[PDB]
Amino acid sequence: TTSYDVVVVGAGIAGLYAIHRFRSQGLTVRAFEAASGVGGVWYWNRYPGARCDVESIDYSYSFSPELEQEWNWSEKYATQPEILAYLEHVADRFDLRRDIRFDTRVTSAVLDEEGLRWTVRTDRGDEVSARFLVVAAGPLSNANTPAFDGLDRFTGDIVHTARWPHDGVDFTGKRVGVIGTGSSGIQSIPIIAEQAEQLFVFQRSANYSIPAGNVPLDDATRAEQKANYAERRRLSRESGGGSPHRPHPKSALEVSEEERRAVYEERWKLGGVLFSKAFPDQLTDPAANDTARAFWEEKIRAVVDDPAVAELLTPKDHAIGAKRIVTDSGYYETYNRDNVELVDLRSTPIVGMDETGIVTTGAHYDLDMIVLATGFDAMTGSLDKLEIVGRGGRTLKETWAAGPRTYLGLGIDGFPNFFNLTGPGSPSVLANMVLHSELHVDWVADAIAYLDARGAAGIEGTPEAVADWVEECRNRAEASLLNSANSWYLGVFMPFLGGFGVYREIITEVAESGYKGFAILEG
Numbered sequence: 001t002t003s004y005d006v007v008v009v010g011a012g013i014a015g016l017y018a019i020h021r022f023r024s025q026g027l028t029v030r031a032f033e034a035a036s037g038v039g040g041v042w043y044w045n046r047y048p049g050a051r052c053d054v055e056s057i058d059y060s061y062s063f064s065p066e067l068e069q070e071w072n073w074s075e076k077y078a079t080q081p082e083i084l085a086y087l088e089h090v091a092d093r094f095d096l097r098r099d100i101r102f103d104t105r106v107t108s109a110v111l112d113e114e115g116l117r118w119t120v121r122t123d124r125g126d127e128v129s130a131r132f133l134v135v136a137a138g139p140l141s142n143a144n145t146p147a148f149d150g151l152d153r154f155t156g157d158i159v160h161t162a163r164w165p166h167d168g169v170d171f172t173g174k175r176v177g178v179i180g181t182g183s184s185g186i187q188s189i190p191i192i193a194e195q196a197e198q199l200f201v202f203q204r205s206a207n208y209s210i211p212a213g214n215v216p217l218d219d220a221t222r223a224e225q226k227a228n229y230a231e232r233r234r235l236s237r238e239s240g241g242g243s244p245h246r247p248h249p250k251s252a253l254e255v256s257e258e259e260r261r262a263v264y265e266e267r268w269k270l271g272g273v274l275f276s277k278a279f280p281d282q283l284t285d286p287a288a289n290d291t292a293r294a295f296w297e298e299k300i301r302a303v304v305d306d307p308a309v310a311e312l313l314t315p316k317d318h319a320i321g322a323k324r325i326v327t328d329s330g331y332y333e334t335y336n337r338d339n340v341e342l343v344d345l346r347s348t349p350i351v352g353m354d355e356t357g358i359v360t361t362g363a364h365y366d367l368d369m370i371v372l373a374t375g376f377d378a379m380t381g382s383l384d385k386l387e388i389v390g391r392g393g394r395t396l397k398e399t400w401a402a403g404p405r406t407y408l409g410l411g412i413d414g415f416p417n418f419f420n421l422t423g424p425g426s427p428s429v430l431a432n433m434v435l436h437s438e439l440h441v442d443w444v445a446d447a448i449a450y451l452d453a454r455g456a457a458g459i460e461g462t463p464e465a466v467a468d469w470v471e472e473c474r475n476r477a478e479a480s481l482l483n484s485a486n487s488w489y490l491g492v493f494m495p496f497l498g499g500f501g502v503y504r505e506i507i508t509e510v511a512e513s514g515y516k517g518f519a520i521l522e523g
């Protein structure tokens with residue numbers, strides 16, 4: 001049982017759909033999942049308050065009419081256990097797990113150029129041959145565990161948001177220090193403060209977060225959206241970010257001072273990702289961004305009592321939406337509490353831990369528990385952990401030395417029959433990852449169907465097409481405030497910034513043209 005049509009790497013949203021979609025075509029699939037279960041990010045990232053940025057109705061599979069009609073999302077923005085349960089249900093329903101080997105990390109993928117097959121190796125001693133290697137490794141992997149001197153000396157509990165205990169952690173009676181104010185921090189903090197004796201948030205750089213405005217979903221409104229699902233999907237697929245939301249017609253500056261608060265208020269209510277896109281120039285024109293930045297500032301100044309904390313909570317120079325806006329539930333309110341202190345790591349950096357807590361420049365902090373609220377690795381993080389050896393035995397990491405280069409994100413010269421899902425060259429995290437996963441898997445499925453219909457052995461990014469795409473990605477991005485020096489989207493600005501629908505049209509039209517920009521390879 002060495003060979004399969006497709007080896008999929010990862011059993012998250014993309015991988016799960018990959019298995020289903022590829023098998024529905026009659027392709028044998030072997031998926032490898034490093035985790036013990038399916039879910040990907042929703043499996044591993046299970047710290048308190050872990051919640052989706054995108055309405056559960058959009059952030060969910062559309063490939064299965066039934067699943068859509070049957071699954072009831074409990075709220076506007078599904079928490080991680082719910083999304084997990086959902087993906088677990090998907091795996092149950094579509095019998096996905098049998099083709100997945102869990103606790104199995106793909107270590108290398110080596111191209112046999114003579115046969116256009118990938119030999120996929122694993123840390124469990126799997127050696128499989130794939131006609132196609134589909135990496136669904138996800139765009140979000142763990143940032144390095146922050147290394148603190150004497151962390152190994154701390155007697156209290158050290159918990160990482162990245163490896164949250166499945167049975168949870170009681171913060172009751174506990175003096176808790178939270179290091180990290182990314183989303184994992186922003187989402188866990190309010191919950192930690194709710195039960196902690198005392199919360200110390202050690203903040204180095206403040207981030208933009210906006211209220212989730214997560215509402216429970218009753219039956220009445222659920223049946224309504226379920227009945228209008230196809231239309232909402234249509235809007236989403238044609239949309240900029242994979243959700244049925246269009247930015248305002250006129251630009252931020254072109255609209256009245258009055259009508260600017262009225263729409264910012266509207267985009268404040270619905271979502272964090274979407275507030276970044278209230279106005280069409282919001283993430284392109286620095287002055288237009290200042291307006292959102294100022295609207296945000298004021299909101300937080302209002303909700304946070306102590307103005308010194310409010311200012312500390314305010315991100316210093318960064319453009320709002322440059323770093324993906326975190327969505328929170330009662331996070332800034334959390335600082336109104338008597339049992340939470342925000343420690344400004346710019347004033348008093350952490351110099352280390354001792355037996356009893358965190359030693360900053362200024363104070364020692366008696367803590368029973370330290371929560372390392374970790375951020376996320378570059379889009380290429382999971383991919384970079386793989387040795388993917390393409391043509392000439394040139395490694396993917398090597399061909400990406402000067403920045404990821406792809407055609408559409410889906411083709412890389414030297415890497416035939418290799419597909420990196422929702423990664424550099426595609427909208428990736430800039431779009432609804434469920435729908436983006438669907439798009440990409442579908443596109444790969446179609447490409448495979450295309451090659452199979454014609455007795456073709458392989459498909460390959462053309463060096464000319466990738467050069468062109470690298471350029472097109474560069475140019476869609478040179479305009480953006482996401483293309484700032486501080487930006488996580490860099491490696492080269494990696495995601496395609498033209499919009500999900502525009503991108504969908506582009507890759508569909510490439511497919512429809514007989515894969516222009518790809519070489520179709522024979523036996």
Ligand SMILES: Cc1cc2nc3c(=O)[nH]c(=O)nc-3n(C[C@H](O)[C@H](O)[C@H](O)COP(=O)(O)OP(=O)(O)OC[C@H]3O[C@@H](n4cnc5c(N)ncnc54)[C@H](O)[C@@H]3O)c2cc1C
Nearest residue numbers: 010012013014034040041053054105106137138140432433
């Ligand atoms: C709190 C939070 C909220 C979010 N909200 C949203 C949202 O609202 N909308 C949105 O579009 N995105 C959101 N994201 C981004 C999220 O990363 C993606 O939506 C999601 O991961 C896409 O699923 P995936 O299958 O592409 O990747 P993942 O969910 O990461 O699944 C990838 C899987 O591949 C595995 N893997 C990686 N490398 C290997 C290897 N070498 N061998 C074996 N297995 C491997 C990983 O273990 C993982 O299980 C959110 C992220 C966080 C942390």
